[PDB]
């Protein structure tokens, strides 16, 4: 008989709707330097640039076209510290401490006709995600809880520590409900990690402070949804003979006589898209500040194309320009981590030479 590879891959089954619209990171890289291992942003749109290639290959030193994706990256708020001990079958959280309520200043309040400014505060936007926050939680209580956690670390029951951070869509005026994420910290010593998280508890983190230009990353997000799709589109089966009187976009035979059952491997219709996916080795071309990209120390250009990004507003905060495309619809929350399985001859860790940036109307 004639052989051929099977239609589609079995390594992404079941092809079901993602458990949570907020992506989860299962594995983290091993880095000596002490820093947060990743960041979060919102997908804005796509554009292209012309750059002198510095990555190894045939096209080295020659100007090349390059598509890039824009992620708006408002600063994250570090508002929790969590500790992990070693359980019987794996890591188990031992304790977790969140900072007490503090006033919120970066809220873009508007003065409407009547009434004063809303005068928002933390624990008020966070309620939209948690809905059950501490009451009468004071600085002394927080200090004693931190001391207890530090004493536990000193005793040595703690094998890991991680940071609880929150997004701030309100500063960019996207929405108000924040997304809470848990991030591992690079390094080796739990004491160093604890000090690093503690010094930033209740404060802000910037992608400029976290990541490095020209480094490889992995992008995690939930892909665009397609609804129910037949096998032709879901798995890539071949259309049946044009003379078929019972349809063309269906599998011919769903199994032999024996086994007397339908094998799970037979392509079939179902959910397509909205899957949790990870893309490896995506280069971080640039990091821009306040929606502006600096080219030659005397030229700066607004990254927003004329008329704005389609189905998106205007980039007003820090942002990331990455090579290639990324999963997720527009405005999706995108997580990025340092390269987990990078190649051996990596590109230099520095911004490339960008000769042109496209800001023409993309609509």
């Amino acid at each position: 008989k004639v052989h051929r590879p099977r239609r589609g891959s079995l390594g992404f089954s079941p092809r079901k709707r993602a458990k949570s619209i907020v992506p989860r990171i299962r594995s983290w890289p091993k880095e000596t330097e002490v820093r947060m291992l990743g960041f979060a942003g919102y997908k804005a749109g796509m554009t292209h640039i012309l750059m002198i290639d510095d990555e190894p290959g045939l096209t080295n030193g020659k100007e090349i076209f390059m598509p890039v994706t824009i992620i708006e990256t408002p600063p994250l708020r570090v508002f929790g510290i969590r500790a992990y001990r070693m359980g019987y079958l794996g890591l188990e959280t031992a304790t977790e401490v969140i900072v007490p309520d503090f006033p919120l200043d970066n809220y873009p309040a508007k003065e409407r006709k009547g009434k004063p400014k809303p005068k928002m505060t933390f624990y008020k936007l966070l309620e939209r995600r948690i809905a059950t926050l501490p009451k009468n939680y004071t600085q002394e209580m927080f200090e004693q809880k931190l001391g207890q956690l530090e004493d536990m670390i000193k005793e040595g029951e703690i094998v890991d520590v991680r940071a609880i951070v929150a997004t701030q869509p309100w500063v960019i005026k996207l929405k108000k409900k924040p997304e809470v994420m848990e991030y591992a910290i690079g390094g080796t010593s739990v004491e160093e990690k604890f000090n690093y998280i503690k010094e930033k508890l209740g404060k802000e983190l910037r992608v400029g402070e976290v990541l490095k230009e020209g480094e490889l990353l992995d992008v995690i997000a939930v892909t665009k949804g397609k609804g129910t799709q037949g096998p032709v589109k879901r798995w890539g089966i071949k259309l049946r003979a044009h003379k078929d009187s019972k349809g063309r976009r269906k599998v011919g035979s769903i199994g032999p006589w024996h086994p007397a059952r339908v094998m799970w491997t037979v392509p079939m219709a179902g959910q397509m898209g909205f899957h949790h996916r990870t893309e490896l080795n995506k280069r971080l071309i640039a990091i821009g500040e306040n929606g502006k990209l600096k080219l030659d120390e005397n030229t700066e250009i607004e990254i927003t194309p004329k008329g704005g990004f389609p189905h998106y507003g205007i980039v007003r905060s820090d942002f990331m320009m990455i090579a290639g495309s990324v999963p997720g619809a527009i405005k999706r929350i995108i997580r990025v981590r340092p390269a987990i399985r990078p190649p051996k001859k990596k590109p230099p860790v520095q911004r490339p030479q960008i000769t042109y940036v496209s800001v023409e109307s993309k609509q």
Binding site: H48, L50, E63, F65, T355, Y356, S358, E360
Partner: protein, 63 residues
């Protein structure tokens, strides 16, 4: 990083866009879009459409 100029509408277009069409005689024509390319090959006169640079030349020709 150079802005080519369309052969039909006479306007420049940004790098990384458009196309170049080669004639059998070696003449090369730059087209900024399928609209311009199709109009050129169909034969619509560029000198009667106000949204082209040839229209100004035609206006000068006719006074």
């Amino acid at each position: 990083a150079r802005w080519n100029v369309c052969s039909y509408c006479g306007k420049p277009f940004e790098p990384g866009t458009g196309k170049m069409y080669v004639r059998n005689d070696g003449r090369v024509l730059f087209f900024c879009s399928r609209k311009c390319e199709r109009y050129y090959f169909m034969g619509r006169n560029p000198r009667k459409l106000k949204w082209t640079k040839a229209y100004q030349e035609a206006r000068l020709q006719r006074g």
